[PDB]
Amino acid sequence: DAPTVPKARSCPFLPPDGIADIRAAAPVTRATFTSGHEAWLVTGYEEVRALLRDSSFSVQVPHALHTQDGVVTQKPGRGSLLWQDEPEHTSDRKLLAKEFTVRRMQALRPNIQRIVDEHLDAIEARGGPVDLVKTFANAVPSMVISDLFGVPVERRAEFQDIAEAMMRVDQDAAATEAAGMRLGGLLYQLVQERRANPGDDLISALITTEDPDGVVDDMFLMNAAGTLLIAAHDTTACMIGLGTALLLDSPDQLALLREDPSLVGNAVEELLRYLTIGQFGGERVATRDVELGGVRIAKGEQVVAHVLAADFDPAFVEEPERFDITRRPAPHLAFGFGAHQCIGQQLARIELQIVFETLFRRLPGLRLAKPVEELRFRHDMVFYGVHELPVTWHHHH
């Protein structure tokens, strides 16, 4: 039996302790995963990039290595992207990217600022202490993406609850699929509504997009909306609560940011790299024999791109365990790489910049109200983070 992949973190803001020696000795190696299956663990930065850029790997993998039962949940089809291979991944991503453009992400900045300031108004009005996860981290990115999609305000809490029920590694396939099925009911209503009553929203723009092959039908819209809505809710929330917790535990770094809000672009790149919240790694399967880091991977063999390990490779950046927001941004792997690299990463960066800049400006003396060693971290979720973050700040006399 290949050694189990290290999971335990003695420092909750760092990778599992065992990872570094594995990456150093054998950045492509056999390991046993949570499901009990053996597969290839890829931990080295250059090798994860090579893995992710190689189009002979498929995302239609045989096992769910990160769940106990190993059962692969039934994934949505065309429009969802994450679970598609070329050539349909390529054409369908192009259709989505025609309307979900980086310039349109950029044009969300004033709305995202308003949402942030509104949730901080509510925090100041209630006074401290507060749990920043429930009052701010989960709520803000939900409002941003729900506004882009014209999701009625009374349904948004249900979307948030689906991400909490669905994006887990501590349950069986039946539980995960039931939450996926409830999400389909919400997506079906939303697509029907946009078709019936088009508006200034992203589904309505996709409905009218150039579509010579007639691929944009309701199932495609539901699948695209589901992937975008859930990814945008869960990942960004996790980064907000965890990057906040890390800065609140990093006094020299938080002082630099407080001195200079214009460093927040560098700080968000370093937070993404350092926290790499996709903690268990991306799964792929070889569709032909390939050589990866000089190791033969056989057709049909599953492989895990451990982006958290890769972002701590000392060959990628100097002293990678040092959290340093003054570093020049480098091309970390927090959004993946190659064909599947995050289509939403510019919107994610914009949200994080506005969130962290405004948060640390507007709550003077923000600081933890519960020590890190007592927080509940997300070892049980696909995306890492904290389940709660109690904070306090200077009182407004």
Residue 203 binds ligand FLI, judged by CB under 6 A: no
The residue number with the shortest CB distance to ligand HEM is: 344
Which of residues 73 and 392 has its CB atom nearest to ligand FLI in the complex? 73
Stretch binding ligand FLI (CB under 6 A), from 9-17, 35-43, 231-239, 363-371: 231-239
In angstroms, give the least distance from the CB of 142 to ligand HEM: 11
Residue type, 71: V
CA 347, distance to chain mean position in Å, is: 12
282 among annotated binding-site residues: yes
CA distances from 282 to 186, 316, 388 (A): 27, 19, 26
The only residue of 29, 67, 146, 235 in contact with ligand HEM, by rule CB under 6 A: 235
Residue 338 binds ligand FLI, judged by CB under 6 A: no
Query: Which of ligand FLI, ligand HEM, none does residue 228 bind to, with CB < 5 to 8 Å depending on kind?
Result: ligand HEM
> What is the C-alpha separation between 38 and 84, in angstroms, rounded?
24
In angstroms, give the least distance from the CB of 72 to ligand FLI: 10
In angstroms, give the least distance from the CB of 354 to ligand HEM: 13
Residue 385 binds ligand FLI, judged by CB under 6 A: no
Binding site for ligand FLI (CB under 6 A): 73-76, 82, 166, 176-177, 180, 183-184, 187, 222-223, 226-227, 230-231, 234-235, 278, 281-282, 305, 307, 336, 382
Binding site for ligand HEM (CB under 6 A): 81-82, 93, 145, 227-228, 231-232, 235-236, 239, 277-278, 282, 334-336, 340, 342-344, 347-348
